[PDB]
RNA sequence: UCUUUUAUUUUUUCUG
């Protein structure tokens, strides 16, 4: 019944949890508030597969 | 008219009446002269600030006027003798718990 | 690891009595009976049992707490009918009411085939 | 007479009745007393010689406890605490051994068939486990493989269902009555109508339904209770409720003696 | 201890008004034309029906403990059906001669209204009120 | 028959044979 | 002490039956952990019986 | 589920049928065609956030693409241009959510409550507890599966290995306690 | 230990089971529950430490809150469903029942009150068997809506020296309230004899509580199929309403709210339609709803649950908002992937159609548990930035106290009221009154 | 166990501030978990699919 | 903060919370084995002489 | 806790005997008030006990799925066919005094599961145990013997309560006492104080 | 709004007024407005009423 | 693990008949409600304490040990 | 004739 995907270090079961995080690749336009000078801002994480 | 305060003068006046047992068809002894030295009396009774000088005495007088105001409207002489039909002991035994009840409710000192 | 003993809810404890009489002050001819290691079965039947005793002006019972098998009841009767002859007479009825009710059941058992 | 007695049906496991001229009092204290204080026999103590079977022994001493055992002379028995002895004895103790070993390559079921009385029992028909299955294996006891032992005593001493269920002689205890509700002593909920949407018990069949014309009888009272004892086995459903009977008759007579010593 | 008023009263009206043991029943005396009376009668154990008569007296009478009849021949006032006690909380006066007697008898209502023939009728504890038809 | 509407009832086989052929922790074994 | 630390019955409380260990005594009194049930208990030594580590013959508070 | 015409006879209809349904009966009870099968036919599409922008997912396999006063209200079929169809809206739900009954007739964060419930939920994780050695272990003495199961436990092994147990219970204040 | 009342000195009573027993009245100022909550005790190590939270901190002398001037504690759950039921007028007990209940009540005076049935039965009334728990002086009087002396419906409430006239007990005269039995009582005889009067209460109630019965099922949300037809209506006709106020939209012919755009406007306006159409359900649910209904009787009693949690339960969830609105376009003029897009449909942005027991739709499950988790986080944001408000306010306010000058000064002297609450008048003391000085015409004022 | 091996863990301070995140998105349809989830300081961060 | 504005505390216990409508307002239910934990240490005195030494 | 949640710890142990119990024989493993049922909303547990007992008469597995066919009218008409009231409600018997409950239970199985939450795990008292070495204080946690902590909230309520005496002997005489040696001109605790 | 103003028979009577809301603070020069009264002139923002109309 | 040999409702004997509702429903091919029936459970306390056992000591023997 | 130990911190998990 038990259906693995877990490591054993040391006898201790662990699980790697899945880390969200922004999609690579993206262009995304935020506003931005009104002290600061920026306005829509455009930002991308741009990475290599 | 609904506003946080002391104590109940309605409902003092119904455990006098309840306790002393008030006929209604029987007319009251009270008088209208003692009606009024009773409230006059009582109002100087009531001490919430006690210091022998002017500034202190204006405070007390300051710091019970609604109090007063509400004494005076409900020990009214038309209520007393009409609304209500307390005897001259009915009449004594409210004042003096009236008296009482202000001197407890008082700040007790040290709260924080 | 400290729940209440199984034994204590019908063994008696050291320096301890099946019964406790006290009279009451509260009113005349009354007095409260304490029980100790029982529970409502004997209480209901005593106390319907003062009940359909004409004699008796109050019978009722309480249990203080469920935690302790113990439980008391009081009974006030008329002046000179002791309520300790009373709870006798409710418990005589009671032994021969049983009692009837055996026979009963013994002997209408057979007539059954099964 | 005192109240009377008519069974409408008998069994061996099953005693369905009526009980009239009976206050409710008595018809509760007879039916607590019955599910609660008839001295009955069980497994009080096991002691496991060995165990390497995949249940924990104290699962299997729970088990042992629960399972039912045979109190016919259970008045003949006497209660351990007031008996005097040695760690065993006849007067107040039943010993029962439990021997299993897996032999066969399939699964070895182990049955309250191969619990074997080693005491002597003097003659009191007492903790013969009991059977009722057609095929008189028993209750399902462990399970073993080829190679799992498990070897045990169990110390049987008379008690009452107050210390644990498993002296309880009685199954499900049926009390009912006045299936029709002319004491109104409950207000059924319903929606559009309480008679449609309310299920007729089966014993409304033996008393006359109420007429809607005449009013409430106030000088009415609960009667004809209509019960329904049912026992697991260890005691047949007679002595049930003969000895629910006796021993409120004994609590009764222990509250007079208490009184009559004061 | 002795009875303080007593008339008849035909029932012009009878109410459940979201209760079914109790009912509120509106009647006015036959003989008395200013009399009026609402009360609420525990139907479950007298039924009542709307222009029915029903004589009503209230007595003061047949600390101190309630008891069983404790006798099968204890004497009483064992002629009415339905009798109540309650307590007295109001004495109201409506068009300088018509009078309302306010009386709670467990929580059961009552009105009694009438004139200066009721003046036997005070504010105590002690208010025994018994029916019959 | 063959070519005959699915139905909601049906989908649950359809269920079974991802869950067969999948599983909970396909995603991290895979 | 010889009662120390030592497996040991009741045999008239309302623990009867209880297997035990002794654990710690104040004079007079016996505590013991019973064998069935998470607790200890307080009990004199002379009314109850005493064990060689290996159950079998039985012996009262005389060793 | 794919959702085109495929049918020259009338509407739209999904692509799977009761022949490919009747298959993957078949592999079940076997132990040929599986979801691999379902994947290159192209029975069933995987879609993801994205992708869900340009598609409009039918909610039923039948209620859609074409009354009992107790049945649920559902908003009939406005649009025609369906291109996909839920295989099951219950399979929205979490482990933890699949174990609740009757999750509409819920108010939400006591759906809530019992997701985070279940996981500290006694039960039988592993069948080798006496195998292994574990820091903290409990096991029920009687495990019980639900009576009010779920098709989804069926998948979930809820039923093989059960988390609490079923109990009598009276919904009533009879001590106050 | 968010406020004063939420720690206090108990009486110690040995009992062999490993939970903390406490009164249940009490959980109130704590705000506690039984479902895991864990609380402290703390032994005082002197005789002078006992003698102050004897005589400072103890339950019956923290009855009265100086928070608002009424009883934080009251009774509560099945004691307060029990006591309505008790209370109604129909309810009447047998002679058993009764002569139990006044040996249960601790300080029963002794005399066996005189029933209401004395002939055809003796029976007493509710009222007269919770008479017996109130001592004798405490006079109460409140009139509800349409209350006379001669209470048709038995609302408000009239007692007199210690004995219920009129009127059912709910929240408003034994729970908390700032005229409430508990305020009179504790006012009058003291907070000792008000503890009497939580316990003796506490008893008898539970006794004709567990000898009476009182539960809930599935039926008592289940309405009748008339009613169900006119809800149904109901919200049909919602929905229509809403469809012709969205084509006036489409078609420009709606006049946008002064101080507020075209879609906020119609937001709003259809926002307040839905709630309209869920609250006018809800009444006719309600009113279908009969006396026997466990949950209208819970309400009624003002125990647990509410007017929209029936309407909810039985008639219509409603309308789900985030952030204040509606449910949003998540992919692009879309709440859902079902949803073909630019449609404000009540579906479409969140209205529920269906009651719990109907059941939602899998889209309105989804709405649903946005809505959770939205209040779930909203909750957990809250919590901690009430608590550093009041850790800031106390540690603000820390040293200000009433010195024997009967003045509020800080720990410098800095006098910051002259007079403590403009009166000298401690805040447990305080109650609601009328000036009738103020109200009047002149020619009332006059006479 | 399962729901730790589905369970997803988002990257942002778990310190208790307004976040959009902490919402369940429209977009979250079918792909996470709408009902499971940790309550208190990790709510709405931390998602199961 | 941590150590001195409040700080740890001896002569005191803390468990699960039960409710017992049989119980008196001002009263509170203890376990037995928290009894036997906390105490509270009295000055012997010769009004309770004699219940000390049955406690010691 | 249920499978909606429902959580809640045993307040009383009742036996069989003393619970009240169905006209079928059958005491109930299990009371909760209710209460809890309309402020929660949880319909779902009522109708799963509904489901539950149809499915126990019946001999089926109940399904419960979010989104089936089946609704509350027709669990209430299987269960009236096997012969129950309609929507699940037993009339049930005092079992303390045989008297019939004037209100009616609504009575059925359905599935709690024990949480990991126990109190024998959660209790705990102090008896001035190990102390910690930097401040010499209680030490932290149940296992080590560990102390509670008069929080900044536990002593402002007590500074609103007013027991002086009892936050001098709660801060001083139980956490933690050490008396120090000054002298008047810089009042500083370097003393040399050789007190034998 | 609704407010209760005195009648010439002495009771408390409830009249129409037109209360002009606003969506911005700037107190100073609105207050000096004519054709308002500037006695009964609110703001829901405090600095800019401790600012000018003073500390009390 | 295996059968509770005591209903925990009311304390029937249900452990004896695990096998025979075994057979009744593989052998006799008939269902739940009726082979339960014909055991002898009539209330559905005892019928939903048979019913709903999850047997794990056939999955806990077939290990190793 | 008493005494007599239970590291620390970084993380995670949930509990109210
Ligand atoms: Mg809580
Ligand atoms: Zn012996
Ligand atoms: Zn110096
Ligand atoms: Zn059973």
Same mark, same amino acid.
């Given at each position: 019944?038990?259906?693995g995907?877990?490591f054993?270090?040391?006898?201790?079961?662990?699980?790697?949890?899945?880390?969200?995080?922004?999609?690579?690749?993206?262009?995304?336009?935020?506003?931005?508030?009104?002290?600061?000078?920026?306005?829509?801002?455009?930002?991308i994480?741009?990475?290599?597969? | 008219?609904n506003?946080?305060?002391?104590?109940?003068?309605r409902?003092?006046?119904?455990?006098?009446?309840?306790?002393?047992?008030?006929?209604?068809?029987?007319?009251?002894?009270?008088?209208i002269?003692? &009606?009024?030295?009773?409230?006059?009396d009582?109002?100087?009774?009531?001490?919430?600030?006690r210091?022998?000088?002017e500034?202190?005495?204006?405070?007390?007088?300051?710091?019970?006027?609604?109090?007063?105001?509400?004494?005076?409207?409900?020990?009214?002489?038309?209520?007393?003798?009409?609304?209500?039909?307390?005897?001259?002991?009915?009449?004594?035994?409210?004042?003096?718990?009236?008296?009482?009840?202000?001197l407890?409710?008082?700040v007790?000192?040290?709260?924080? | 690891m400290?729940?209440?003993?199984?034994?204590?809810?019908?063994?008696?404890?050291?320096?301890?009595?099946?019964?406790?009489?006290?009279?009451?002050?509260?009113?005349?001819?009354?007095?409260?009976?304490?029980?100790?290691?029982?529970?409502?079965?004997?209480?209901?039947?005593?106390?319907?049992?003062?009940?359909?005793?004409?004699?008796?002006?109050?019978?009722?019972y309480?249990?203080?707490?469920?935690?302790?098998?113990?439980?008391?009841?009081?009974?006030?009767?008329?002046?000179?009918?002791?309520?300790?002859?009373?709870?006798?007479?409710?418990?005589?009825?009671?032994?021969?009411?049983?009692?009837?009710? @055996?026979?009963?059941?013994?002997?209408?058992?057979?007539?059954?085939?099964? | 007479?005192?109240?009377?007695? @008519?069974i409408?049906?008998?069994?061996?496991?099953?005693?369905?009745?009526?009980?009239?001229?009976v206050?409710?009092?008595?018809?509760?204290?007879?039916?607590?007393?019955?599910?609660?204080?008839?001295?009955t026999?069980?497994?009080?103590?096991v002691?496991?010689?060995?165990?390497?079977?995949?249940?924990?022994?104290?699962?299997?001493?729970?088990?042992?406890?629960?399972?039912?055992?045979?109190?016919?002379?259970?008045?003949?028995?006497?209660y351990?605490?007031?008996?005097?002895?040695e760690?065993?004895?006849?007067?107040?103790?039943?010993?029962?051994?439990?021997?299993?070993?897996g032999?066969?390559?399939?699964?070895?079921?182990?049955?309250?068939?191969?619990?074997?009385?080693?005491s002597?029992?003097?003659?009191?028909?007492?903790?013969?486990?009991?059977?009722?299955?057609?095929?008189?294996?028993?209750?399902?006891?462990?399970?073993?493989?080829?190679?799992?032992?498990?070897?045990?005593?169990?110390?049987?001493?008379?008690?009452?269902?107050?210390?644990h269920?498993?002296?309880?002689?009685?199954?499900?205890?049926?009390?009912?009555?006045?299936?029709?509700?002319?004491?109104?002593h409950?207000?059924?909920?319903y929606?559009?109508?309480?008679?449609?949407?309310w299920?007729?018990?089966?014993?409304?069949?033996?008393?006359?339904?109420?007429?809607?014309?005449?009013?409430?009888?106030?000088?009415?009272?609960?009667?004809?209770?209509?019960?329904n004892?049912?026992?697991?086995?260890?005691?047949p459903?007679?002595?049930?409720?003969?000895?629910?009977?006796?021993?409120?008759?004994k609590?009764?007579?222990?509250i007079?003696?208490?009184?009559?010593?004061? | 201890?002795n009875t303080?008023?007593?008339?008849?009263?035909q029932?012009?009206?009878?109410?459940?008004?979201?209760?079914?043991?109790?009912?509120?029943?509106?009647?006015?005396?036959?003989?008395?034309?200013?009399?009026?009376?609402?009360?609420? &009668?525990?139907?479950?154990?007298?039924?009542?029906a709307?222009?029915?008569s029903?004589?009503?007296?209230?007595?003061?009478?047949?600390?101190?403990?309630?008891?069983?009849?404790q006798?099968?021949?204890?004497?009483?006032?064992?002629?009415?059906?339905?009798?109540?006690?309650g307590?007295?909380?109001?004495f109201?006066?409506? !068009?300088?001669?018509?009078?309302?007697?306010?009386?709670?008898?467990?929580?059961?209502?009552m009105?009694?209204?009438?004139?200066?023939?009721?003046?036997?009728?005070?504010?105590?504890?002690?208010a025994?009120?018994?029916?019959?038809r | 028959?063959?070519?005959?509407?699915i139905?909601?009832?049906?989908?649950?086989?359809?269920?079974?044979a991802?869950?067969?052929?999948?599983?909970?922790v396909?995603?991290?074994?895979? | 002490?010889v009662?120390?630390?030592?497996?040991?019955?009741?045999?008239?409380?309302?623990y009867?039956?209880?297997?035990?260990?002794?654990?710690?005594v104040?004079?007079?009194?016996?505590?013991?952990?019973l064998? !069935?049930?998470?607790?200890?208990?307080?009990?004199?030594?002379?009314?109850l019986?005493?064990?060689?580590?290996?159950?079998?013959?039985?012996?009262?508070?005389?060793? | 589920?794919?959702?085109?015409?495929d049918?020259?006879?009338?509407?739209?209809?999904?692509?799977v049928?009761?022949?490919?349904?009747?298959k993957?009966?078949?592999?079940?009870?076997?132990?040929?065609?599986?979801?691999?099968?379902?994947?290159?036919?192209?029975?069933?599409?995987?879609?993801?956030?994205?992708?869900?922008?340009?598609?409009?997912?039918?909610?039923?396999?039948?209620?859609?693409?074409?009354?009992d006063?107790?049945?649920?209200?559902?908003?009939?079929?406005?649009a025609?241009?369906?291109?996909?169809?839920?295989?099951?809206p219950?399979?929205?739900?979490?482990?933890?959510? !699949?174990?609740?009954?009757?999750?509409?007739?819920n108010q939400?964060?006591?759906?809530?409550?019992?997701?985070?419930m279940?996981?500290?939920?006694?039960?039988?994780?592993?069948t080798?507890y006496?195998?292994?050695?574990?820091?903290?272990?409990?096991?029920?003495?009687?495990?019980?599966?639900?009576?009010?199961?779920?098709?989804?436990?069926?998948?979930?092994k809820?039923?093989?290995?059960?988390?609490?147990?079923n109990?009598?219970?009276?919904?009533?204040?009879?001590?106050?306690? | 230990?968010?406020?004063?009342?939420?720690?206090?000195?108990?009486?110690?009573?040995?009992?062999?089971?490993?939970?903390?027993?406490?009164?249940?009245?009490?959980?109130?100022?704590?705000?506690?529950?039984?479902?895991?909550?864990?609380?402290?005790?703390?032994?005082?190590?002197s005789?002078?430490?006992?003698?102050?939270?004897?005589?400072?901190?103890?339950?019956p002398?923290?009855?009265?809150?100086?928070?608002?001037? @009424?009883?934080?504690?009251?009774?509560?759950?099945?004691?307060?469903?029990?006591?309505?039921?008790?209370?109604?007028?129909?309810?009447?007990?047998?002679?058993?029942?009764?002569?139990?209940?006044?040996?249960?009540?601790?300080?029963?005076?002794?005399?066996?009150?005189?029933?209401?049935?004395?002939?055809?039965?003796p029976?007493?009334?509710?009222?007269?068997?919770?008479?017996?728990?109130?001592?004798?002086?405490?006079?109460?009087?409140?009139?509800d809506?349409?209350?006379?002396?001669?209470?048709?419906?038995?609302?408000?409430?009239?007692?007199?020296?210690?004995?219920i006239?009129?009127?059912?007990?709910?929240?408003?005269?034994?729970?908390?309230?700032?005229?409430?039995?508990?305020?009179?009582?504790?006012?009058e @005889?003291?907070?000792?004899?008000?503890?009497?009067?939580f316990?003796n209460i506490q008893?008898?109630?539970?006794?004709?509580?567990?000898?009476?019965?009182?539960?809930?099922?599935?039926?008592?949300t289940?309405?009748?199929?008339?009613?169900?037809r006119?809800?149904?209506?109901?919200?049909?006709?919602?929905?229509?309403?809403?469809?012709?106020?969205?084509?006036?939209?489409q078609?420009?012919?709606?006049?946008?709210?002064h101080?507020?755009?075209?879609?906020?406007?119609?937001?709003?306006?259809?926002?307040?339609?839905?709630?309209?159409?869920?609250d006018?359900?809800?009444?006719?649910?309600?009113?279908?709803?009969?006396?026997?209904?466990?949950?209208?009787?819970?309400?009624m009693?003002?125990?647990?649950?509410?007017?929209?949690?029936?309407?909810?339960?039985?008639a219509?969830?409603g309308?789900?908002?985030?952030?204040g609105?509606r449910?949003?376009?998540?992919?692009?003029?879309?709440?859902?992937?079902?949803? !073909?897009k630019?449609?404000?449909?009540?579906?479409?942005?969140?209205?529920?159609?269906?009651?719990?027991?109907?059941?939602?739709?899998?889209?309105?499950?989804?709405?649903?548990?946005?809505?959770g988790?939205?209040?779930?986080?909203?909750?957990?944001?809250?919590?901690?930035?009430?608590?550093?408000i009041?850790?800031?306010?106390?540690?603000?306010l820390?040293?200000?106290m009433?010195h024997?000058?009967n003045?509020?000064?800080?720990?410098?002297?800095?006098?910051?009221?002259?007079?403590?609450?403009?009166?000298?008048?401690?805040?447990?003391?305080?109650?609601?009154?009328?000036?009738?000085?103020?109200g009047?015409?002149?020619?009332?004022?006059?006479? | 166990?399962?729901?730790?091996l589905?369970?997803?863990?988002?990257?942002?301070?778990?310190?208790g501030?307004?976040?959009?995140?902490?919402?369940?998105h429209?977009?979250?349809?079918?792909?996470?978990?709408?009902?499971?989830?940790?309550?208190?300081?990790?709510?709405?961060?931390?998602?199961?699919? | 903060?941590?150590?001195?504005?409040?700080?740890?505390?001896?002569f005191?216990?803390?468990?699960?919370?039960?409710?017992?409508?049989?119980?008196?307002?001002?009263?509170?239910?203890?376990?037995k084995?928290?009894?036997?934990?906390?105490t509270?240490?009295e000055?012997?005195?010769?009004?309770?002489?004699?219940?000390?030494?049955?406690?010691? | 806790?249920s499978?909606?949640?429902?959580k809640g710890?045993?307040?009383?142990?009742?036996?069989?005997?003393?619970?009240?119990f169905?006209?079928e024989?059958?005491?109930?493993?299990?009371?909760?008030?209710?209460?809890?049922?309309?402020?929660?909303?949880?319909?779902a547990?009522? &109708?799963?006990?509904?489901?539950?007992?149809?499915?126990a008469?019946?001999?089926?597995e109940?399904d419960?799925?979010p989104?089936?066919?089946?609704?509350?009218?027709g669990?209430?008409?299987?269960?009236?066919?096997?012969?129950?009231?309609?929507?699940?409600?037993?009339?049930?018997?005092?079992?303390?005094?045989?008297?019939?409950?004037?209100?009616?239970?609504?009575?059925?199985?359905?599935?709690?599961?024990?949480?990991?939450?126990?109190?024998?795990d959660? &209790?705990?008292?102090?008896?001035?145990?190990?102390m910690?070495?930097?401040?010499?204080?209680?030490?932290?946690?149940?296992?080590?013997?560990?102390?509670?902590?008069?929080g900044?909230?536990?002593?402002?309520?007590?500074?609103?309560?007013?027991?002086?005496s009892?936050?001098?002997?709660?801060?001083?005489?139980?956490?933690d006492?050490?008396?120090?040696?000054?002298?008047?001109?810089?009042?500083?605790?370097?003393?040399?104080?050789?007190?034998? | 709004?609704?407010?209760?103003?005195?009648?010439?028979?002495?009771?408390?009577?409830?009249?129409?007024?037109?209360?002009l809301?606003?969506?911005?603070?700037?107190?100073?020069e609105?207050?000096?407005?004519?054709?308002?009264?500037?006695?009964?002139?609110?703001?829901?923002?405090?600095?800019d009423?401790?600012?000018?109309?003073?500390?009390? | 693990?295996?059968?509770?040999?005591?209903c925990?409702?009311?304390?029937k004997?249900?452990?004896?008949?695990?096998?025979?509702?075994?057979?009744?429903?593989?052998?006799?091919?008939?269902?739940?409600?009726?082979?339960?029936?014909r055991?002898?459970?009539?209330?559905y306390?005892?019928?939903?304490?048979?019913?709903?056992?999850?047997?794990?000591?056939?999955?806990?023997?077939?290990?190793?040990?």
């Open positions: 019944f038990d259906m995907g877990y054993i270090i040391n006898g201790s079961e662990k699980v790697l949890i899945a880390q969200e995080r922004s999609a690579g690749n993206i262009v995304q336009v935020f506003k931005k508030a009104a002290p600061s000078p920026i306005s829509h801002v455009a930002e994480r741009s990475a290599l597969e | 008219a506003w946080p305060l002391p104590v109940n003068i409902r003092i006046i119904q455990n006098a009446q309840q306790t002393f047992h008030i006929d209604h068809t029987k007319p009251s002894d009270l008088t002269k003692d &009606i009024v030295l009773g409230v006059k009582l109002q100087e009774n009531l001490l919430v600030l210091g022998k000088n500034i202190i005495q204006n405070a007390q007088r300051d710091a019970v006027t609604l109090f007063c105001c509400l004494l005076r409207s409900r020990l009214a002489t038309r209520r007393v003798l009409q609304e209500y039909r307390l005897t001259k002991q009915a009449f004594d035994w409210v004042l003096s718990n009236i008296e009482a009840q202000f407890r409710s008082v007790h000192p040290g709260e924080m | 400290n729940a209440p003993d199984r034994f204590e809810l019908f063994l008696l404890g050291e320096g301890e009595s099946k019964l406790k009489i006290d009279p009451d002050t509260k009113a005349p001819n009354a007095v409260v009976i304490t029980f100790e290691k029982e529970d409502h079965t004997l209480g209901n039947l005593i106390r319907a049992e003062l009940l359909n005793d004409r004699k008796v002006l109050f019978a009722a309480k249990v203080e707490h469920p935690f302790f098998a113990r439980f008391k009841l009081r009974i006030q009767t008329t002046e000179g009918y002791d309520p300790k002859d009373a709870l006798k007479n409710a418990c005589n009825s009671i032994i021969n009411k049983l009692g009837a009710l @055996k026979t009963n059941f013994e002997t209408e058992w057979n007539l059954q085939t099964l | 007479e005192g109240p009377q007695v @008519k409408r049906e008998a069994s061996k496991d099953n005693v369905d009745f009526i009980l009239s001229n206050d409710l009092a008595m018809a509760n204290s007879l039916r607590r007393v019955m599910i609660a204080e008839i001295p026999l069980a497994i009080d103590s002691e496991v010689e060995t165990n390497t079977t995949v249940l924990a022994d104290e699962f299997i001493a729970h088990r042992l406890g629960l399972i039912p055992l045979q109190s016919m002379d259970i008045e003949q028995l006497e351990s605490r007031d008996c005097f002895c760690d065993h004895c006849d007067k107040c103790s039943v010993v029962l051994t439990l021997q299993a070993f032999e066969s390559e399939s699964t070895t079921n182990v049955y309250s068939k191969d619990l074997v009385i080693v002597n029992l003097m003659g009191r028909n007492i903790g013969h486990p009991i059977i009722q299955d057609k095929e008189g294996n028993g209750v399902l006891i462990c399970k073993l493989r080829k190679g799992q032992e498990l070897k045990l005593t169990c110390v049987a001493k008379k008690g009452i269902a107050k210390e269920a498993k002296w309880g002689p009685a199954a499900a205890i049926e009390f009912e009555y006045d299936p029709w509700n002319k004491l109104k409950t207000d059924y909920w929606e559009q109508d309480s008679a449609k949407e299920p007729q018990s089966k014993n409304c069949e033996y008393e006359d339904p109420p007429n809607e014309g005449d009013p409430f009888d106030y000088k009415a009272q609960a009667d004809t209770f209509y019960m004892v049912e026992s697991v086995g260890s005691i459903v007679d002595q049930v409720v003969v000895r629910g009977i006796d021993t409120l008759q609590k009764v007579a222990s007079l003696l208490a009184l009559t010593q004061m | 201890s303080l008023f007593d008339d008849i009263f029932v012009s009206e009878v109410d459940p008004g979201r209760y079914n043991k109790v009912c509120r029943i509106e009647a006015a005396s036959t003989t008395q034309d200013q009399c009026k009376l609402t009360l609420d &009668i525990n139907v479950e154990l007298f039924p009542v709307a222009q029915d029903l004589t009503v007296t209230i007595a003061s009478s047949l600390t101190r403990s309630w008891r069983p009849p006798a099968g021949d204890r004497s009483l006032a064992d002629d009415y059906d339905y009798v109540m006690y307590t007295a909380y109001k109201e006066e409506v !068009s300088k001669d018509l009078i309302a007697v306010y009386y709670s008898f467990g929580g059961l209502l009105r009694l209204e009438g004139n200066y023939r009721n003046l036997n009728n005070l504010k105590q504890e002690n025994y009120l018994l029916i019959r | 028959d063959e070519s005959a509407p139905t909601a009832e049906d989908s649950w086989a359809v269920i079974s991802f869950f067969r052929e999948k599983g909970l396909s995603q991290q074994l895979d | 002490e009662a120390l630390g030592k497996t040991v019955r009741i045999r008239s409380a309302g009867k039956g209880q297997l035990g260990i002794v654990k710690d104040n004079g007079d009194k016996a505590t013991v952990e064998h !069935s049930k998470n607790k200890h208990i307080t009990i004199d030594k002379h009314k019986t005493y064990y060689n580590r290996e159950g079998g013959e039985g012996i009262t508070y005389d060793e | 589920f794919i959702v085109e015409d049918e020259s006879l009338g509407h739209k209809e999904l692509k049928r009761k022949g490919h349904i009747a993957l009966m078949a592999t079940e009870y076997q132990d040929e065609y599986t979801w691999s099968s379902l994947l290159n036919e192209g029975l069933v599409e995987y879609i993801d956030a994205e992708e869900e922008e340009s598609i409009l997912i039918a909610m039923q396999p039948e209620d859609l693409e074409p009354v006063p107790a049945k649920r209200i559902r908003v009939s079929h406005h025609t241009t369906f291109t996909h169809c839920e295989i099951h219950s399979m929205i739900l979490g482990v933890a959510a !699949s174990i609740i009954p009757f999750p509409d007739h939400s964060p006591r759906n809530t409550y019992q997701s985070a279940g996981k500290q939920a006694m039960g039988v994780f592993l080798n006496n195998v292994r050695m574990d820091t903290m272990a409990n096991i029920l003495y009687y495990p019980q599966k639900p009576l009010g199961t779920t098709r989804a436990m069926e998948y979930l809820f039923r093989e290995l059960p988390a609490g147990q109990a009598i219970v009276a919904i009533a204040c009879y001590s106050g306690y | 230990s968010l406020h004063k009342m939420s720690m206090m000195a108990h009486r110690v009573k040995v009992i062999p089971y490993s939970t903390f027993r406490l009164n249940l009245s009490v959980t109130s100022p704590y705000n506690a529950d039984f479902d895991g909550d864990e609380m402290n005790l703390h032994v005082p190590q005789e002078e430490t006992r003698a102050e939270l004897s005589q400072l901190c103890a339950v002398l923290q009855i009265v809150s100086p928070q608002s001037n @009424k009883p934080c504690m009251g009774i509560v759950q099945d004691t307060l469903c029990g006591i309505r039921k008790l209370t109604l007028r129909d309810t009447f007990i047998e002679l058993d029942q009764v002569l139990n209940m006044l040996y249960w009540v601790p300080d029963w005076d002794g005399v066996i009150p005189t029933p209401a049935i004395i002939k055809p039965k029976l007493w009334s509710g009222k007269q068997i919770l008479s017996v728990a109130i001592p004798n002086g405490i006079h109460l009087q409140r009139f809506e349409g209350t006379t002396l001669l209470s048709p419906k038995d609302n408000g409430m009239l007692i007199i020296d210690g004995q006239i009129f009127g059912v007990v709910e929240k408003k005269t034994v729970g908390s309230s700032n005229g409430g039995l508990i305020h009179v009582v504790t006012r @005889k003291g907070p000792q004899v008000c503890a009497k009067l316990g008893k008898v109630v539970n006794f004709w509580l567990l000898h009476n019965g009182f539960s809930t099922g599935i039926g008592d289940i309405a009748d199929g008339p009613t169900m006119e809800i149904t209506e109901t919200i049909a006709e919602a929905k229509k309403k809403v469809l012709d106020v969205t084509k006036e939209a078609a420009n012919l709606l006049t946008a709210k101080g507020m755009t075209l879609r906020e406007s119609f937001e709003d306006n259809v926002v307040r339609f839905l709630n309209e159409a869920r006018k359900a809800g009444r006719l649910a309600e009113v279908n709803l009969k006396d026997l209904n466990n949950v209208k009787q819970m309400v009693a003002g125990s647990k649950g509410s007017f929209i949690n029936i309407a909810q339960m039985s219509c969830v309308q789900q908002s985030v952030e609105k449910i949003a376009f998540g992919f692009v003029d879309r709440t859902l992937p079902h949803f !073909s630019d449609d404000y449909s009540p579906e479409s942005k969140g209205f529920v159609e269906n009651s719990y027991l109907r059941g939602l739709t899998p889209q309105e499950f989804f709405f649903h548990a946005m809505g988790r939205e209040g779930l986080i909203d909750t957990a944001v809250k919590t901690a930035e009430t608590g550093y009041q850790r800031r306010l106390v540690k603000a820390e040293d200000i009433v024997y000058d003045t509020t000064r800080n720990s410098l002297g800095n006098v910051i009221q002259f007079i403590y609450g403009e009166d000298g008048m401690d805040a447990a003391h305080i109650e609601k009154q009328s000036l009738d000085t103020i009047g015409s002149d020619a009332a004022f006059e006479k | 166990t399962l729901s730790h589905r369970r997803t863990n988002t990257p942002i301070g778990r310190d501030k307004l976040a959009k995140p902490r919402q369940l429209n977009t979250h349809w079918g792909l996470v978990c709408p009902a499971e989830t940790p309550e208190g300081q990790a709510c709405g961060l931390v998602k199961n699919l | 903060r941590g150590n001195l504005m409040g700080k740890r505390v001896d005191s216990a803390r468990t699960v919370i039960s409710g017992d409508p049989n119980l008196e307002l001002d009263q509170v239910g203890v376990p084995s928290i009894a036997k934990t906390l509270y240490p000055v012997v005195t010769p009004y309770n002489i004699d219940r000390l030494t049955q406690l010691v | 806790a499978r909606h949640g429902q710890t045993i307040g009383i142990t009742y036996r069989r005997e003393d619970m009240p169905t006209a024989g059958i005491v109930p493993d299990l009371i909760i008030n209710p209460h809890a049922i309309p402020s929660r909303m949880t319909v547990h009522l &109708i799963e006990c509904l489901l539950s007992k149809v499915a008469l019946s001999g089926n109940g419960a799925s989104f089936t066919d089946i609704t509350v009218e669990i209430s008409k299987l269960l009236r066919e096997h012969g129950y009231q309609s929507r699940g409600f037993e009339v049930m018997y005092n079992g303390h005094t045989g008297k019939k409950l004037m209100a009616q239970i609504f009575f059925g199985p359905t599935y709690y599961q024990r949480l990991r939450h126990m109190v024998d959660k &209790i705990h008292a102090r008896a001035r145990g190990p910690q070495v930097l401040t010499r204080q209680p030490v932290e946690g149940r296992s080590r013997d560990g102390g509670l902590r008069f900044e909230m536990e002593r402002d309520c007590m500074i609103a309560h007013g027991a002086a009892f936050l001098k002997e709660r801060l001083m005489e139980a956490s006492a050490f008396r120090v040696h000054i002298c008047g001109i810089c009042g500083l605790m370097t003393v040399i104080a050789k007190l034998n | 709004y609704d407010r209760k103003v005195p009648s010439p028979t002495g009771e408390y009577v409830k009249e129409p007024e037109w209360v809301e606003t969506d911005g603070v700037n107190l100073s609105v207050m000096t407005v004519p054709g308002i009264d500037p006695t009964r002139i609110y703001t829901n923002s405090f600095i009423i401790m600012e000018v109309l003073g500390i009390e | 693990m295996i059968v509770p040999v005591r925990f409702s009311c304390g004997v249900v452990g004896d008949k695990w096998e025979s509702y075994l057979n009744l429903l593989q052998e006799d091919e008939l269902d739940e409600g009726t082979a339960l029936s055991l002898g459970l009539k209330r306390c005892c019928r939903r304490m048979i019913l709903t056992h999850v047997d794990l000591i056939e999955k806990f023997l077939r290990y190793n040990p």
